[PDB]
Design a protein around this ligand. Structure first.
Ligand code: ZN
Lengths: 55, 195, 99, 214, 68, 149, 135, 64
RNA sequence: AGGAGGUGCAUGGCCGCCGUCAGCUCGUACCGUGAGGCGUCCACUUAAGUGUGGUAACGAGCGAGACCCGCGCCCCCAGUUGCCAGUCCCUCCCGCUCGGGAGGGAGGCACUCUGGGGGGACUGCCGGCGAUAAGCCGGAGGAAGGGGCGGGCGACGGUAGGUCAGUAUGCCCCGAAACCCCCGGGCUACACGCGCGCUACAAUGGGCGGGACAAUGGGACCCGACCCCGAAAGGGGAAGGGAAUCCCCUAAACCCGCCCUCAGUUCGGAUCGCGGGCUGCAACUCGCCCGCGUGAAGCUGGAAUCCCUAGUACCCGCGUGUCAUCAUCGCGC
């Protein structure tokens, strides 16, 4: 019965150092401008964030 | 850079909107507006039921102020609540209300027709309501009820038409509700009149 | 002299602030440099549409445009007092520098 | 190597490459005469601008057409002289300066060897390498039939130029002979009607097949 | 220069030596034999004839003929 | 005349030939055993490539001055053969450029501008311009069109 | 003195030309046109002057500054700028007609620009695509 | 294909019926009059309406 | 509670395909006992159910078009962090300076450029065809002639197509285990078959020295000029830059001079040996870089098969996404 265990070691780099602020996923995190969002979540919140589709 | 500030503000606002949408579902949440003041910030919440938002004695509103200050990093926030400009034109509010009715237990066809006729009567160019899920059996289906004039493809469709989506959780699964409303006074590029 | 850097998302609010500054300088009686439009910043992010890997790969190019204007105004008590009294809408960020 | 007066050649008259004039060049084929452009032109480089217009190649100088035909690899989906010539990273594809230099050196070699105008020799080679008849399939009833057909001057010129370029590529492929020397030899042989020329051999083969079909 | 020789640091002597022909083959064979004798992973790979520098063997390095 | 009035390669080779008389310009002790960049495959085949490189660096300082070691390195770099990997651009070495610039400064042709790089002294400008004038005078007979320049 | 400025654009290359009375000195980026390499680019730059004539060439001075593009785009832009400057300086409608008949692009710019790339092997080009497998 | 749009045709016909003497065979004048008389906000649509108005005026003149 | 445990044959959302295909429906009337039919058919035309005319149909809705972003030409406004053509001052160099060139200053915005608002192109006019209509072909003028060019926007429905392993979610299941954390290993194995590519089988070249010309984007535990130390990798100090101010950033293909001269070679660069570095807590499984050394198939490819119509294809490099380090990859230039 120790609380020293069941805790996650701090990590300053790697896939486990970044999680989506909406999901917690460890995969395709977008850090282009500090967004820290999944490629799935960005597709959903781009209109809310103000991004549009001029091209 | 300078765009980092815009990105951070947009992300914070989107997080605030999502959390408020989750928390105040029964209050007919219709959005929020955030204004910056030299002493802090003011958040105005659009709601059709201020009673639930403020609560009895303001416990909910003080808790919301505390959580907005502490978890969202907003500095000195003050919260105000005010009415929806048009609940029958706000697509998100209508979708949430239809999902709540489905959860309550009204028949899907009756509830959809009631919402359609209410929105039609309260003034609109066109309405479309799509219900998708395990309706009438274990095999999923999608049913659409439409009235009036609506646009689906193009810039006028993306701009004028207001869309909303809701999820109704029954005892058998989730049902998706999509509501698209064309507000009155919207003029298509085709519509040209002689002076 | 004072340098005003105004950056926003919508050119209409940018132009409203710029016109406010131009009218305020015209009534104020100072030598003001015209609004210099700096190059627009276009943040472009290309993302895969599908959440899975099946099917033909398709991408969408989300874009966010930030417009910037620069104004130079000669220093004056009532001038830059009225300048600090600008309405400064929400979607516009304004920076003041003294040189 | 090259003389300085040639490395820094400065033309003063409107003539092909600043060295040769087309005033005395004569085309005695009425079919190909209107489609061989010999207007006074100094630099044979129009940067395209003729593919958009139908029949637009009739206003392009013959030297530029030869340069464009030379600017290639030699063979990708067909075999010339029984071999593929797939040169990917070491081809003249999209190297107009290299094609221009090769054509200029070939013209100089042709002039030195013949004593006549290199453009005149090229015109003679094109005339002697342009086929006059071909064969094609026509579907009448419910089945096809191979019949002999005439060839438009446009296609005649195109085939002649392509055959000359292919013959030059084959002669220069994997031998001590250079591309310019191979092109000059091919042009001279085609002008002199010698069967060793790839263009003339192909013209004879096509005409014989058309005669057999008709 | 000391950085242009064949053996910039000899295993035994520690001097900078340049070897040609029979000496070079003998030195390379001795290094491989030392790896095999100490039973290193590189020695195992040298013995088996498989690539030694951590390459992927699923789709390439196919020396044998088709089977099945 | 001026450096702008003559072709680059002829002027570079003439300046390299002239530079052999300057005692300051001396090849380093490691010159015979080094390559002129990581992207290069074989040693130089001139046995006097040091003077050519010094002349090229001097002309570059004359033209694009002030210039620095890193910018000269990215100028002198080039494409590399990476085996099965696709070709890629790489920068050149720094020791050769630094030694050449130091030798030029010792000879008095260039001088350091702090925080900006190295510029050409009036002596170096005259040294380049005299050779350029001689080259243009030689070229005038072959190309009469250069007389008006 | 009478100084006339003209501009030429080809692809991403922009050339600004200044023409004035002189002794036939034409310089591109401070370098005499006679020592311009390669020969194809030198001919591209020199064609309008040859068309204009020896006397007009020798009784005028042109200075051209070109930025952007490649060695051929810069040559085309310089050629267009020089042609426009010559026409404006001479005011010769016959010369303008000769230029138009010889090459329309000398007086009228080239609208052609690179087409943006599209997915399915974007790095290769707008229309180039990955090879199909079918099995 | 350059097929005139139905609403363009309808607007042009209504304009030519309501103001018969305000439109001539001159495209520039017709375009100016169309811009002044109707609330079209797109230059391309205004030009198309003006062109069809000019065509209809020419047909009315020659007697179709 | 928790579950990246089963179920995508229970679902929501999103995505691929039919398909940017031209289709999918409604009000009333009319036909047929009825399922259904008409309109939505016929002739011509269009990329289009896009239009003209006839008609037991008359009128509509969603699609298409319209619409939105960018490119090419011109005009007005604006002149800094952007630009330097004319005028003035200073310094330096050349053929000794008649003349020419370079840099720094004041100064200007004239040109380029940046970003706001407008103009222009609409089958507008001429000839012909079609029927005089819809429309089509050619030509004049024009920066741009016929959807101006390239994109975004994917209809009613289906495909029990893929996704519960991105989030949400019903049932079932584990529930002290299938839940949570840590050390080590594996996803990187290797007789073989296959798909996408990179490198080449050389002279339309290989090596050496020299000479030129870009754009898109990114930069705070970050990009880093500049100086010094090293043969290279790399190491030490450090100006400026939250960016039209500083940096990544003096690309390659291309051109000139020399060597090689048709050869498994001065082609080709896998495969190994020794040594030197970078990142990281850790580099053997299982990272990347440089120096010397060795130098395997490969000398043009059967049947078969893929992409592309204008700045397109081919060839040549660069930026960014992933990233402490790693790009033969995706997206762009
Ligand atoms: Zn997420």
């Amino acid at each position: 019965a120790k609380a020293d265990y069941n805790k996650r070691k701090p990590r300053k780099f790697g896939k486990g150092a970044r999680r989506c602020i909406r999901c917690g996923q460890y995969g395709p995190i977008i850090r282009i401008q500090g967004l820290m969002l999944c490629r799935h979540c960005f597709r959903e919140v781009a209109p809310k964030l103000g991004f549009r589709k001029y091209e | 850079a300078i765009e980092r500030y815009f990105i951070r503000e947009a992300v914070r606002e989107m997080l605030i909107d999502e959390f408020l949408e989750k928390e105040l579902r029964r209050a007919g949440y219709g959005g929020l507006d955030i204004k910056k003041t030299p002493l802090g910030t003011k958040v105005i919440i659009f709601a059709a039921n201020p009673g639930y938002v403020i609560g009895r004695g303001g416990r909910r509103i003080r808790e919301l102020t505390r959580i907005l200050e502490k978890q969202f990093g907003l500095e000195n926030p003050q919260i105000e609540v005010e009415e929806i400009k048009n609940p029958y034109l706000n697509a998100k509010v209508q979708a949430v209300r239809l999902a709540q009715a489905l959860e309550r237990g009204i028949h899907f066809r009756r509830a959809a027709y009631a919402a359609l006729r209410a929105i039609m009567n309260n003034g609109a160019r066109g309405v479309e309501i799509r219900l998708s899920g395990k309706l009438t059996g274990e095999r999923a289906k999608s049913i659409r009820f439409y009235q009036g004039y609506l646009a689906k493809v193009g810039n006028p469709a993306e701009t004028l038409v207001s869309k909303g989506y809701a999820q109704a959780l029954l005892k058998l699964g989730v049902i998706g509700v999509k509501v698209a409303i064309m507000p009155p006074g919207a003029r298509l590029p085709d519509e040209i009149e002689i002076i | 002299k004072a340098r005003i850097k105004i950056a926003s998302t919508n050119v209409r609010s940018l132009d409203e602030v710029a016109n406010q500054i131009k009218q305020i300088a015209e009534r104020t009686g100072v030598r003001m440099s015209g609004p210099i439009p700096l190059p627009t910043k276009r943040i472009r992010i290309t993302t895969r549409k599908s959440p899975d890997g099946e099917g033909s790969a398709t991408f969408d190019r989300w874009e966010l445009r930030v417009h910037k204007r620069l104004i130079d105004i000669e220093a004056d008590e009532r001038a830059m007092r009225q300048i600090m009294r600008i309405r400064v809408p929400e979607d516009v960020t304004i920076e003041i520098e003294l040189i | 190597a090259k003389p300085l007066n040639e490395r820094f050649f400065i033309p003063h008259e409107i003539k092909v490459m600043g060295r040769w004039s087309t005033e005395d060049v004569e085309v005695r084929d009425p079919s190909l005469k209107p489609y061989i452009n010999l207007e006074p032109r100094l630099l044979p480089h129009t940067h395209g601008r003729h593919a958009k217009k139908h029949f637009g190649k009739a206003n392009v100088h013959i030297v530029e057409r030869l340069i464009n035909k030379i600017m290639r690899s030699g063979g990708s989906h067909y075999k010339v002289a029984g071999h593929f010539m797939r040169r990917e990273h070491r081809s003249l594809n999209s190297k107009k300066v290299k094609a221009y230099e090769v054509v200029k050196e070939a013209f100089k070699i042709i002039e030195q060897r013949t004593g006549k105008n290199p453009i005149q020799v090229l015109v003679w080679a094109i005339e002697n390498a342009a086929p006059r008849e071909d064969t094609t399939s026509v579907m009448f009833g419910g089945i096809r039939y191979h019949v002999a057909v005439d060839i438009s001057p446009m296609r005649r010129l195109d085939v002649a130029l392509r055959n000359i370029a292919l013959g030059a590529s084959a002669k220069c492929y994997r031998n001590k002979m250079s591309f310019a020397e191979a092109l000059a030899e091919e042009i001279i042989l085609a002008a002199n009607k010698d069967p060793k020329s790839y263009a003339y051999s192909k013209k004879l083969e096509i005409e014989r097949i058309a005669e057999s079909s008709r | 220069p000391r950085w242009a020789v064949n053996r910039p640091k000899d295993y035994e002597t520690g001097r900078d030596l340049h070897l040609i022909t029979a000496k070079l083959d003998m030195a390379i064979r001795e290094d491989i034999m030392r790896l095999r004798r100490i039973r290193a992973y590189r020695g195992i790979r040298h013995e088996l004839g498989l690539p030694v520098r951590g390459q992927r063997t699923r789709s390439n390095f196919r020396r044998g003929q088709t089977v099945g | 005349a001026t450096v702008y009035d003559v072709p680059g390669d002829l002027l570079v080779e003439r300046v390299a030939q002239r530079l052999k008389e300057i005692p300051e310009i001396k090849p380093p002790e490691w010159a015979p055993f080094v390559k002129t960049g990581r992207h290069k495959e074989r040693l130089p085949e001139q046995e006097d490539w040091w003077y050519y490189r010094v002349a090229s660096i001097l002309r570059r300082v004359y033209l694009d001055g002030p210039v620095g070691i890193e910018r000269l390195r990215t100028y002198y770099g080039g494409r590399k053969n990476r085996g099965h990997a696709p070709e890629k651009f790489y920068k050149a070495g720094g020791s050769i450029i630094r030694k050449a610039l130091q030798q030029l400064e010792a000879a008095g042709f260039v001088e350091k501008v702090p925080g900006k790089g190295r510029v050409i002294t009036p002596k170096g400008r005259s040294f380049l311009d005299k050779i350029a004038t001689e080259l243009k005078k030689e070229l005038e007979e072959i190309i009469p069109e250069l007389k008006k320049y | 003195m009478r100084i006339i400025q003209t501009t030429g654009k080809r692809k991403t290359a922009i050339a600004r030309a200044v023409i004035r009375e002189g002794k036939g000195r034409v310089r591109i980026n401070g370098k005499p046109v006679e020592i311009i390499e390669p020969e194809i680019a030198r001919f591209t730059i020199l064609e309008p002057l040859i068309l204009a004539g020896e006397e007009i060439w020798n009784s005028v001075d042109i200075d051209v500054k070109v930025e952007g593009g490649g060695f051929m785009g810069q040559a085309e832009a310089a050629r267009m700028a020089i042609a426009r400057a010559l026409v404006e300086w001479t005011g010769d409608m016959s010369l303008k007609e000769k230029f138009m008949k010889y090459d329309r692009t000398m007086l009228v710019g080239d609208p052609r620009r690179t087409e943006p790339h599209k997915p399915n092997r974007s790095t290769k080009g707008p229309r180039a695509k990955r090879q199909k497998s079918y099995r | 294909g350059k097929i005139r749009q139905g609403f363009i045709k309808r607007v042009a016909r209504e304009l030519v019926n309501k103001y018969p003497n305000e439109f001539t065979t001159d495209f520039e004048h017709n375009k100016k009059k169309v811009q002044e008389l109707t609330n079209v906000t797109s230059k391309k649509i205004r030009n198309r309406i003006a062109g069809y108005v000019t065509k209809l005026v020419r047909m009315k003149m020659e007697g179709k």
